[PDB]
């Protein structure tokens, strides 16, 4: 499976308040990963730096997505966390276009193996093309989201 070895908990699914900045999002999604020992304690700083220099916005619509991550050397165990935003927050387009991506769904990746990154990207790209499912993510509670993603993780 593309998502073999990736740890995922209900505790890794977060609805974030409408106030949040991009940095706020990264810190909040990092939090449960740090405290489960999945990443280095300054993981959030390293993802923030990466995002500034090599952005991870994917210009899908009507639900924009971002895939923030950093160097695998900052990861101790494989995990993903998921942020649902109440209002869009701009991420820059990974493809290099000047127009921002209004993001509502954030997949933070903590992957310890560089050679596994494209597997998870491929899986994400597959997931976010169910238009109905992306819509559902904006209204589903954390348990509904956990189960829906867990099902998709398990092929």
């Amino acid at each position, epitope marked *: 499976n593309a998502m073999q070895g990736i740890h995922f908990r209900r505790h890794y699914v977060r609805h974030l308040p409408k106030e949040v900045s991009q940095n706020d999002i990264i810190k909040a999604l990092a939090s449960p990963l740090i405290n489960d020992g999945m990443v280095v304690s300054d993981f959030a700083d390293h993802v923030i730096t990466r995002e500034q220099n090599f952005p991870t916005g994917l210009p899908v619509e009507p639900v924009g997505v971002a895939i923030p991550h950093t160097d695998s050397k900052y990861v101790r165990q494989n995990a993903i966390s998921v942020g649902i935003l109440a209002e869009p927050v701009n991420f820059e387009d990974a493809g290099g276009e000047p127009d921002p991506v209004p993001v509502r769904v954030v997949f933070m990746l903590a992957l310890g193996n560089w050679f596994d990154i*494209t597997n998870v990207l*491929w899986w994400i790209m597959d997931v976010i093309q169910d238009e109905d499912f992306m819509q559902q993510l904006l209204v589903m509670n954390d348990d509904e989201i956990y189960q829906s993603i867990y099902t998709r993780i398990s092929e």
Partner: antibody
Amino acid sequence: QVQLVQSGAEVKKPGSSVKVSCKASGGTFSSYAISWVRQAPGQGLEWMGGIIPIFGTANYAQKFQGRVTITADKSTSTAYMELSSLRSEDTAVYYCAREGTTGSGWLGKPIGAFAYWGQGTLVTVSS
Amino acid sequence: EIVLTQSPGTLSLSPGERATLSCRASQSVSSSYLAWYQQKPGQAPRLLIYGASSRATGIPDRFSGSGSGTDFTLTISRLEPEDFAVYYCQQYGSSPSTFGQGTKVEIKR
């Protein structure tokens, strides 16, 4: 198949630098890992580093970090390896390689292993 | 750094015979991240097996891979003239990817 075509042989002096290109055709570029691999003549294979173009940042083997720069130009589906401060010991054939995918079509699940190889680029360094 | 040690160094066999090649890893590697390549002199490497046991597209059935943990095997069930070559194993379970030193499969006189 994906085709990978590299730039031609480089005949270099010590202390110089070289930039080798790897042009991909016949498949997807943005979302699949491209690596560079060194092979001295008559000897084994060494992974230098790689890049996933859509994410923009290269990953390096410690051995090669800080003399090797790997980049990708999404608009031309071309990857690059730049080697600086060349020495005679750098004489080798340099390959680009791209991971394979599963199934039919161009956006299949990636396999990590290198299904596609460029033809190689000889860099000689002497005198 | 994970070291892959291949054996034997050299294998001397006739066409039609079975070749059995070993790749031993200094640390456990997940089966999902072990590959085998064929390389003929003056040519680029060619992928045979990925994920320890999956045949790459177009690769004939006579090539098969197996094993797990620290111990992996490539089998060529019936050698063709075109199979005499150097074979490499590779792990890509972490950065940096490392390769074995190669086994030379050569034709017996």
